[PDB]
Amino acid sequence: YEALRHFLLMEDGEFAQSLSDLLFEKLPGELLNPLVLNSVLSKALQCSLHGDTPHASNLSLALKYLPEVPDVLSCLELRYKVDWPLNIVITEGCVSKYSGVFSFLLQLKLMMWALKDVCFHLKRTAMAGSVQFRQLQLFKHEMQHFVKVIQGYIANQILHVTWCEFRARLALEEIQRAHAEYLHKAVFRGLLTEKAAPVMNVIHSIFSLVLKFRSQLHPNFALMQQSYNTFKYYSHFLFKVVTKLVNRQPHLEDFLLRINFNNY
Amino acid sequence: REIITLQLGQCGNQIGFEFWKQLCAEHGISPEGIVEEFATDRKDVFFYQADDEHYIPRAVLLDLEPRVIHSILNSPYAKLYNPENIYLGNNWASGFSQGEKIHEDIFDIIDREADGSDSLEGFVLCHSIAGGTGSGLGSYLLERLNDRYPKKLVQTYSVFPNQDEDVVVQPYNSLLTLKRLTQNADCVVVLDNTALNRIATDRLHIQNPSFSQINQLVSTIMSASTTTLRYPGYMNNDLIGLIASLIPTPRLHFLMTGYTPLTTDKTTVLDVMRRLLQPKNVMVSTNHCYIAILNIIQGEVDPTQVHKSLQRIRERKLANFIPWGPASIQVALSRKSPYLPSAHRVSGLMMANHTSISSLFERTCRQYDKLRKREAFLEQFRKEDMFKDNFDEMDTSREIVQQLIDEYHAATRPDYISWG
């Protein structure tokens, strides 16, 4: 458990911050073959000192969809393998849902990459102190901040409260039920539910706009400013939509205080 | 990845020596670099994995008129690190001209560790503002540093030099250092010698060994700033990830420090969060209001109550932070660091962007204004004349610090959608 949490939920840093950082340097079918895809995991494990454990093996990397590629789709499979007498407790329907939540966590890190890209592209023209420069950069910080509060929320719910109630949840059938409750609270607090599905639907609109924001570096000031205005409109609209669905969930109540804090 | 640290001046060499000693004391190592048997964590952030299983810190030593350097030399913490980086006035102009001629050899000292490192992440500067030897030299080397490598970050640990009256050339020196501190530095953590002296005379009755205890304070702050990097954390395990959230505007990069216990010689989450929020635990001393606050906690903390703590500190509603786009006070939670004995467990550190430092800037600007108007305290030397014949560098720094006070004050306004 305390191995797979650091790989599929990635609690230990400089593993994600190396694997995703290595893959994003490149950009496809010469990227999905197992000579670059099979090697990046073995290089990412060395710069966290995760390797040379009996839990550094049984890791199988793959991907579930091949792109030919705005795009918010990222695709990866990581599995853990347990033998016969441990197959009875962790099931292979449980592992499939672990990969499912792994992709959900992975899509957030693409934002953490794209914001560093646009921060990096502005760095060589940062010399100037122009009007077009400062007001443009305020957009970039404000889009960065939304990810830094929602990632803090995920980084609270899916690792601190749901793991504190896993260090006394375990006690033979009770072990299987306890692990099945661990995944249950993770998918419950992860907003994959059909009830909070429109709340997840607005997050796509935020993500796509930041990816389109990244491509423009100066090109023209107004085109990115329009996207900033739509972004502000979307965030203000999300705050009301999540308010209605707490006024009509206990973990989601924390999201209300997260997105609005000494503003409106 | 890998961060290279710099120290110059006797005060900067003191705080770096204390920092390296204090991290030697924190980590399970000997003062020779030998690992202990009870070790794990990430020890590549400032420590070179050296050749005898030594974790050698990567520190650039710069000194002029060496006094403290001999005391650093005859110590058992010269067996911890010795990269052979030692290379030999009290004015900014004198230190500037002395740095002028020998820039290539100390730049070879830079490039030695640069090629010695596989990766590079940032440069931390231990510099004493208006420190005599440190002033001028540090400004010149800061200018060359950001000139050579625009792909890295610069942090500078700075003090606010005034003991509230002494030396009449110090506002000129600190002003020129502040000009480079604005436009050639990307993150500034400012400290107050007055506020630290007041807190030292508060918790204890010491006022004479103030440097030695202030070393303890700054080393604890610097270690607590890096605990999420040195120990396995999850966010801001790089410097730039920490720096990114705090800065909405690239000249608003001045960082305020507080710390939840005041005396260091069960409580709940929202308690120490609230006490870290107050200005009387802030150890750096019209409306003045925070742009954005980040806080780190390290100690024995029950993790499941933090969201109710978050709600309670919300509805307590202590600061009316900002009017334009939405920042927050933002929490990070860390484990208390192992491998050493730990007293006073619950300890928090806060990084904040506050416009209240514009008051201290206006203080030293008023001091410069009266000393410039009186015109008997410039202390005219040939160094200052040969560096600048018309002394318009002071004018350029003056209009820039005016622009920064304007930036502070217009950011305090509800309109900063127009620039100013």
Swiss-Prot record, chain A:
Compartments (UniProt record): Cytoplasm, Cytoskeleton, Microtubule organizing center, Centrosome
Family: Belongs to the TUBGCP family.
Self-association and partners: Component of the gamma-tubulin ring complex (gTuRC) consisting of TUBGCP2, TUBGCP3, TUBGCP4, TUBGCP5 and TUBGCP6 and gamma-tubulin TUBG1 or TUBG2. TUBGCP2, TUBGCP3, TUBGCP4, TUBGCP5 and TUBGCP6 assemble in a 5:5:2:1:1 stoichiometry; each is associated with a gamma-tubulin, thereby arranging 14 gamma-tubulins in a helical manner. Gamma-tubulin at the first position is blocked by TUBGCP3 at the last position, allowing 13 protafilaments to grow into a microtubule.
Purpose: Component of the gamma-tubulin ring complex (gTuRC) which mediates microtubule nucleation. The gTuRC regulates the minus-end nucleation of alpha-beta tubulin heterodimers that grow into microtubule protafilaments, a critical step in centrosome duplication and spindle formation.
UniProt disease link: Microcephaly and chorioretinopathy, autosomal recessive, 1: A syndrome characterized by microcephaly, cognitive impairment, underdeveloped retina and choroid, and epilepsy in some patients. The more anterior parts of the retina, near the periphery and pars plana, have a grayish hue and diminutive vasculature similar to retinopathy of prematurity. Visual impairment becomes evident during the first year of life.
UniProt protein name: Gamma-tubulin complex component 6
Lineage summary: Eukaryota, Metazoa, Chordata, Craniata, Vertebrata
Full-protein residues shown: 1517 to 1815 of 1819
Curated annotation (Swiss-Prot), chain B:
Gene Ontology biological-process entries: cytoplasmic microtubule organization; meiotic spindle organization; microtubule cytoskeleton organization; microtubule nucleation; mitotic cell cycle; mitotic sister chromatid segregation; mitotic spindle organization
Binding site for GTP: A130, G131, G132, T133, G134, S135, G136
Modified how: Phosphorylation at Ser-119 by BRSK1 regulates centrosome duplication, possibly by mediating relocation of gamma-tubulin and its associated proteins from the cytoplasm to the centrosome.
One matching Pfam family: Tubulin_C
Chain positions found as Phosphoserine: S119
Cystines in this chain: none
SUPFAM superfamilies: Tubulin C-terminal domain-like, Tubulin nucleotide-binding domain-like
Primary location group: cytoplasm
The protein's assembly and partners: Component of the gamma-tubulin ring complex (gTuRC) consisting of TUBGCP2, TUBGCP3, TUBGCP4, TUBGCP5 and TUBGCP6 and gamma-tubulin TUBG1 or TUBG2. TUBGCP2, TUBGCP3, TUBGCP4, TUBGCP5 and TUBGCP6 assemble in a 5:5:2:1:1 stoichiometry; each is associated with a gamma-tubulin, thereby arranging 14 gamma-tubulins in a helical manner. Gamma-tubulin at the first position is blocked by TUBGCP3 at the last position, allowing 13 protafilaments to grow into a microtubule.
Record-stated family: Belongs to the tubulin family.
PANTHER family: TUBULIN
Function: Tubulin is the major constituent of microtubules, protein filaments consisting of alpha- and beta-tubulin heterodimers. Gamma-tubulin is a key component of the gamma-tubulin ring complex (gTuRC) which mediates microtubule nucleation. The gTuRC regulates the minus-end nucleation of alpha-beta tubulin heterodimers that grow into microtubule protafilaments, a critical step in centrosome duplication and spindle formation.
Protein known as: Tubulin gamma-1 chain
Source organism of the structure: Homo sapiens
Lineage, top ranks: Eukaryota, Metazoa, Chordata, Craniata, Vertebrata
Gene expressing this chain: TUBG1
